[PDB]
Structure 1
Amino acid sequence: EIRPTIGQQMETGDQRFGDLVFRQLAPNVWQHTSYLDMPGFGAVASNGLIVRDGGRVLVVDTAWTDDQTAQILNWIKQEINLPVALAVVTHAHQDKMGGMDALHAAGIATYANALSNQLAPQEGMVAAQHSLTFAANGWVEPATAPNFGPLKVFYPGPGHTSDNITVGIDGTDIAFGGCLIKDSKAKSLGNLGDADTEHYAASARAFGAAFPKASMIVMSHSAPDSRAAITHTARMADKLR
């Protein structure tokens, strides 16, 4: 099996499919995990979500690469056998947006923060085809997120990057923090190279306040955790100021 250098390991409840791992989180929600092999370091796991909404599927984040993202679509075809309506990607870095071309080739409508689309070319990424915009309190402008079903998109403020967004899954107790949120036992906040160290703590807390009843917090590089992931992330971020 795949034993990443960074990221959660495989546990009971995980399905290996090609080069990826899938884990059911709820009747209608699965976590996708893909792995970047770094020469001399090993594999770095990155997680996103797959959500069934009636007769259609919604995706949060690509895999690291186009081929891995095509494998996600193949898993969906095999295990769910319903079309992917749209994908939302949570900022312009390779773990979240590296597979855009595979989504586009498949005819899937793609959405990202307008700022992520603006940064994408600068980051070696392909922009999403549609831009999300946000209110002053972080909630997505509904006209920019048409037919999103249970996906509730929230921009918490600058943190891991200035463009990072988060997604709650309405009708569940799950919320997705992407790379903004690290697990409750993490020793670091990960890559702070593009981070806003002044605002990170407030942004992490704003994510918590946006989804105050989410009990399962999903994130990019660890297994789903309790709300202690949010509070621990914010406490680490307090030390940056």
Structure 2
Amino acid sequence: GDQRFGDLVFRQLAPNVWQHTSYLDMPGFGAVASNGLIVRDGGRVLVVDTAWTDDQTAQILNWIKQEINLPVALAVVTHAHQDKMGGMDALHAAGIATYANALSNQLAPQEGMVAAQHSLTFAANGWVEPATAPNFGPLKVFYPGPGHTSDNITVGIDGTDIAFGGCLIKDSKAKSLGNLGDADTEHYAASARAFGAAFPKASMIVMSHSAPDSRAAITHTARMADKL
């Protein structure tokens, strides 16, 4: 179930996949959960998204050491907001190679984040240029277009039914898309549908701010984004 480890929560989603959850008090919204992923690929571990803070991200690494006990080969972060990139310095202090969309790295300083060490770039069709994501194993990285932010990226896990929409996708019963100050209102709806079409076999949709949901999360998020 939900394994409490300090102030974080870990949930196993598949034999080699876990969801990490961390919380930040956001004045006005309560204590906001943010989810990322941990994937074991043979003898190494891959991380998708930091926690909100360096201290929480160090706790993710401590949980990995206790429950998996294999080296963390790399982390990929899915856009330049605090819930996804707030713990970059903890990854760097641990010697972990970090990757983000080139545009996320460009935006990181003005968003108050530390950039990742390596920049991903994407083909016209949205799939990562393979030379920019070396040794990613089962992680399949896709840029669906601007939506929640201009830089948001998404990740499928080969060998599982899981795809990660990050903060682009909301659950089946969300009422709004949240803060939209950085959003691309013209393109959001198409980007959400593009994520669904890039991972057509994924039946478990993991996202930043809700528990894992069915593909109705994608259709509902798209159906909601159609209106704007």
> After TM superposition, is the score higher than 0.5?
yes
Distance 1:41 1:227, change over 3 A: closer
Specify the SS of the correspondent of 1:110: strand
Q: Which runs of 4+ in 1 moved over 3 A?
A: none
Cα displacement (A) at 1:191:
1.5
Cα displacement (A) at 1:37:
1.6
Match of 2:162 in 1: 174
**Root mean square deviation, CA, Å:** 0.7
Alpha-carbon distance in structure 2 between the residues aligned to 1:94 and 1:102? 13
Correspondences of 1:63-212 after superposition (within 5 Å):
63-212=51-200
Aligned residues: 228
Bigger mean CA offset, 189-198 vs 147-156: 189-198
Structure 2 unaligned spans of 5+: none
Alpha-carbon distance in structure 2 between the residues aligned to 1:134 and 1:40? 36
Structure 1 unaligned spans of 5+: 1-12
Specify the SS of the correspondent of 2:179: coil
Alpha-carbon distance in structure 2 between the residues aligned to 1:59 and 1:40? 30
Match of 1:227 in 2: 215
Alpha-carbon distance in structure 2 between the residues aligned to 1:193 and 1:104? 29
1:115-148 per-residue CA deviation (whole Å, 9 max, x = no partner) reads: 0000000100000000000000000000000000
Alpha-carbon distance in structure 2 between the residues aligned to 1:157 and 1:46? 22
Q: What fraction of aligned residue pairs are identical, expressed as a percent?
A: 100
1:81-104 per-residue CA deviation (whole Å, 9 max, x = no partner) reads: 001000000000000000000000
Alpha-carbon distance in structure 1 between the residues aligned to 2:43 and 2:90? 22
Specify the SS of the correspondent of 1:208: helix
Structure number with higher strand proportion: 2
Specify the SS of the correspondent of 2:166: coil
1:144-178 per-residue CA deviation (whole Å, 9 max, x = no partner) reads: 00000000000000000000000000010000000
Cα displacement (A) at 1:190:
1.4
Specify the SS of the correspondent of 1:198: coil
Cα displacement (A) at 1:40:
6.1
